[PDB]
Structures are given as C-alpha cells and as structure tokens.
Design an enzyme around this catalytic site. Structure first.
Site, PDB file in Angstrom:
ATOM      1  N   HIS A  62       0.866  -1.226   0.000  1.00 26.38           N
ATOM      2  CA  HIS A  62       0.000   0.000   0.000  1.00 26.38           C
ATOM      3  C   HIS A  62       0.883   1.250   0.000  1.00 26.38           C
ATOM      4  O   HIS A  62       0.528   2.238  -0.677  1.00 26.38           O
ATOM      5  CB  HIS A  62      -0.945   0.059   1.218  1.00 26.38           C
ATOM      6  CG  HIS A  62      -1.728  -1.192   1.417  1.00 26.38           C
ATOM      7  ND1 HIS A  62      -1.575  -2.005   2.511  1.00 26.38           N
ATOM      8  CD2 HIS A  62      -2.712  -1.737   0.654  1.00 26.38           C
ATOM      9  CE1 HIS A  62      -2.444  -3.026   2.402  1.00 26.38           C
ATOM     10  NE2 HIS A  62      -3.138  -2.875   1.289  1.00 26.38           N
ATOM     11  N   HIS A  92       5.378   7.252   6.478  1.00 23.33           N
ATOM     12  CA  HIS A  92       5.114   6.810   5.111  1.00 23.33           C
ATOM     13  C   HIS A  92       4.563   7.969   4.358  1.00 23.33           C
ATOM     14  O   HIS A  92       4.335   9.060   4.920  1.00 23.33           O
ATOM     15  CB  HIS A  92       4.158   5.639   5.041  1.00 23.33           C
ATOM     16  CG  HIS A  92       2.841   5.994   5.627  1.00 23.33           C
ATOM     17  ND1 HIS A  92       2.533   5.883   6.963  1.00 23.33           N
ATOM     18  CD2 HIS A  92       1.771   6.606   5.053  1.00 23.33           C
ATOM     19  CE1 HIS A  92       1.350   6.399   7.187  1.00 23.33           C
ATOM     20  NE2 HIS A  92       0.875   6.852   6.042  1.00 23.33           N
ATOM     21  N   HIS A  94       1.890   9.171   0.854  1.00 24.35           N
ATOM     22  CA  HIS A  94       0.875   8.967  -0.178  1.00 24.35           C
ATOM     23  C   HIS A  94       1.245   9.855  -1.365  1.00 24.35           C
ATOM     24  O   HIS A  94       1.694  10.962  -1.170  1.00 24.35           O
ATOM     25  CB  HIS A  94      -0.513   9.314   0.326  1.00 24.35           C
ATOM     26  CG  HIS A  94      -0.850   8.632   1.612  1.00 24.35           C
ATOM     27  ND1 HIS A  94      -1.593   7.460   1.676  1.00 24.35           N
ATOM     28  CD2 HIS A  94      -0.487   8.933   2.859  1.00 24.35           C
ATOM     29  CE1 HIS A  94      -1.745   7.136   2.957  1.00 24.35           C
ATOM     30  NE2 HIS A  94      -1.010   7.963   3.668  1.00 24.35           N
ATOM     31  N   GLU A 104      -3.567  13.529   0.429  1.00 23.51           N
ATOM     32  CA  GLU A 104      -4.842  13.137   0.988  1.00 23.51           C
ATOM     33  C   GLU A 104      -5.597  14.359   1.513  1.00 23.51           C
ATOM     34  O   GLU A 104      -6.692  14.620   1.061  1.00 23.51           O
ATOM     35  CB  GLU A 104      -4.575  12.137   2.130  1.00 23.51           C
ATOM     36  CG  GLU A 104      -3.925  10.862   1.562  1.00 23.51           C
ATOM     37  CD  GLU A 104      -4.125   9.659   2.392  1.00 23.51           C
ATOM     38  OE1 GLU A 104      -3.856   9.695   3.615  1.00 23.51           O
ATOM     39  OE2 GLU A 104      -4.655   8.648   1.824  1.00 23.51           O
ATOM     40  N   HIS A 117       3.197  11.268   6.304  1.00 21.84           N
ATOM     41  CA  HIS A 117       2.543  11.025   7.572  1.00 21.84           C
ATOM     42  C   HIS A 117       3.540  10.435   8.502  1.00 21.84           C
ATOM     43  O   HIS A 117       4.017   9.323   8.294  1.00 21.84           O
ATOM     44  CB  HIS A 117       1.394  10.026   7.391  1.00 21.84           C
ATOM     45  CG  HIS A 117       0.253  10.637   6.644  1.00 21.84           C
ATOM     46  ND1 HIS A 117      -0.749   9.885   6.045  1.00 21.84           N
ATOM     47  CD2 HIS A 117      -0.035  11.930   6.382  1.00 21.84           C
ATOM     48  CE1 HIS A 117      -1.581  10.723   5.436  1.00 21.84           C
ATOM     49  NE2 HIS A 117      -1.191  11.963   5.658  1.00 21.84           N
ATOM     50  N   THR A 196      -6.353   6.966   7.477  1.00 21.14           N
ATOM     51  CA  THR A 196      -6.833   7.169   6.149  1.00 21.14           C
ATOM     52  C   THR A 196      -6.783   5.875   5.316  1.00 21.14           C
ATOM     53  O   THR A 196      -7.096   5.936   4.129  1.00 21.14           O
ATOM     54  CB  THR A 196      -6.094   8.248   5.432  1.00 21.14           C
ATOM     55  OG1 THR A 196      -4.715   7.838   5.283  1.00 21.14           O
ATOM     56  CG2 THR A 196      -6.123   9.584   6.146  1.00 21.14           C
TER      57      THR A 196
END
Ligand SMILES: O=C(O)/C=C/c1ccc(Cl)cc1Cl
Ligand code: NA
Ligand code: NA
Ligand SMILES: [Zn+2]
Length: 258
Positions: A62, A92, A94, A104, A117, A196
């Site tokens: 992910h 990590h 996104h 996000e 994050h 999230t």
C-alpha cells in the site's frame, strides 16, 4: 481483507468491510483556510526527534513504511493540541501518478504531489494496538510535498527504494534522521479524525503543517517506480495511493497561526 486503490478495491469500496468509512470523523478532509480559526490557546508544538532510532523500511503493498524503535521515548511529539506524550512508530507517504495529485488532505481544494505522515501513539495506552482503540490514541503529523528543488534529507529514502520494489520486501534502514523531512515552520492546522487506510479507526489527532516541503521531480519519480504487487506478479505501479477528502461533518479545523 483485500483493500487497495484500484477501481475494484479502492476507497469507494472500503465501507463494505469497514463501515466506519462512512463515520463522523473520517480523514482526510479539505482544509478551508478561510473557515479554519486561529486558536490562541494552542500550545507550541514540540517535535523531539534527536534520539530517533530508525530500523527498517518495508513495502507493505500500500505504501512503504520507515519503522522506528518505539520501545522507549526516543522520538516524540508533544504540545500543540496534544495532552501527554506521543511516540514515533513509523512514517510513510501517499503520492500520485502525476504532480497535480497525491496528497490526501487538500488546502482550499488544492492537491499536492504527495503527503508525508509521521505516525505517533499516545504512551498512556502502553502499546500501539491499544492506542488505536482510543479517540486520542494517535497523533499524525502531516506534511505536504510539492515538486521543486530536491529535499536532501529525503534522498536516503529514495535510494533504498530499488531494494524494496515489491510487496513484502524490507531493508535495513538504520541511522535515518526524520528531522530532515521537516519544513522550516511548524505552523499547523489541527482537527480530530481517522486513519486514512483501513481499518479507518477514529483515533487520530491530525496535525497538518502549513508549509509544504519541496522534493525534486526525480525524487517523486522514484516513488512511482515502486510496485503494489509482490515479486513475480504482474507489475502494478504504486501510484495514487491516496484517499480523497471525506465529509467534515461536525468538526472545526483550528489554526496555530493568524
Ligand atoms: O496510511 C495511513 O495513514 C495509515 C496508517 C495505518 C494503517 C493501519 C493501522 Cl492499524 C494504523 C496505521 Cl497508523
Ligand atoms: Na520512537
Ligand atoms: Na476554500
Ligand atoms: Zn498515511
């Protein structure tokens, strides 16, 4: 569970296995800068990462997580909206397929290229798994990435990504200093929300920095060469691993700055 970010297993689907997807304090949200109110009572934010002990970097199918030793108070976040002490467990990102999307949280509906994050848990709950069952169990420091100049303190991360291309691969990742990922200002927005990704638990105090960091197009391109799939499976590039903005509902976003 077989959740992801594609048409068939992406955010629109998550509510069937994780009904809290449609709850009252879901994240991310759009941050409307003209509605967020300065809160003079917010204390100063304290990022205490001098003793941080990074261990390992893992492609989990992910994102990739950089994991820390959280067996003691080595790297903690305190102050701001927080009561007590929150221990860094992992960070990590996104990111997008293109520079115009990937974050996000949004700012006045603006999407950034990516979002970092830094995940911390409340040490009054003893361990991470207990903390995620509490409404004040986690504090996530969120930092926007825009494409511009390279971020030198990110380069050790991008250079190890070739060694964890596919799901389930990990690499040693000691002696990484997460202070190198911060912007200059710690001005922030804060609101109560959620993880999230599944399980989407409503356990997070969100602290989103106003100032984005700049990374180079080469740096983010290397993020997009990762794979969601495992080794020896058909290649699915790890891009667009972001959940879109969720309803604010009955919440107020507070600003630490005027
Ligand atoms: O991508 C994210 O922001 C979610 C990370 C995450 C995902 C699952 C669990 Cl239990 C806990 C955490 Cl902090
Ligand atoms: Na730590
Ligand atoms: Na707006
Ligand atoms: Zn995240």
């Amino acid at each position: 569970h077989h959740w992801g970010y594609g048409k068939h297993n992406g955010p629109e689907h998550w509510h069937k296995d994780f009904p809290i997807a449609k709850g009252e304090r879901q994240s991310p949200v759009d941050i409307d800068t003209h509605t967020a109110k300065y809160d003079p009572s917010l204390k100063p934010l304290s990022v205490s990462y001098d003793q941080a002990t990074s261990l390992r970097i893992l492609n989990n199918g992910h994102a990739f997580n950089v994991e820390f030793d959280d067996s003691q108070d080595k790297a903690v976040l305190k102050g701001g909206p927080l009561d007590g002490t929150y221990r860094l467990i992992q960070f990590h990102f996104h990111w997008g397929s293109l520079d115009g999307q990937g974050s996000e949280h949004t700012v006045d509906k603006k999407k950034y290229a990516a979002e970092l994050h830094l995940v911390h848990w409340n040490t009054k709950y003893g361990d991470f798994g207990k903390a995620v069952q509490q409404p004040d169990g986690l504090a996530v420091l969120g930092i926007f990435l825009k494409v511009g100049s390279a971020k030198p303190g990110l380069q050790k991360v991008v250079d190890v990504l070739d060694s964890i291309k596919t799901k389930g691969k990990s690499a040693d990742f000691t002696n990484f200093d997460p202070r190198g990922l911060l912007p200059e200002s710690l001005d922030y927005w804060t609101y109560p929300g959620s993880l999230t990704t599944p399980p989407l638990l409503e356990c997070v105090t969100w602290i989103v920095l106003k100032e984005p960091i700049s990374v180079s197009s080469e740096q983010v391109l290397k993020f997009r060469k990762l794979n969601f799939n495992g080794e020896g499976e058909p290649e699915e590039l790890m891009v667009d691993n972001w959940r879109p903005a969720q309803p604010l509902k009955n919440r107020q976003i507070k600003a630490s700055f005027k």
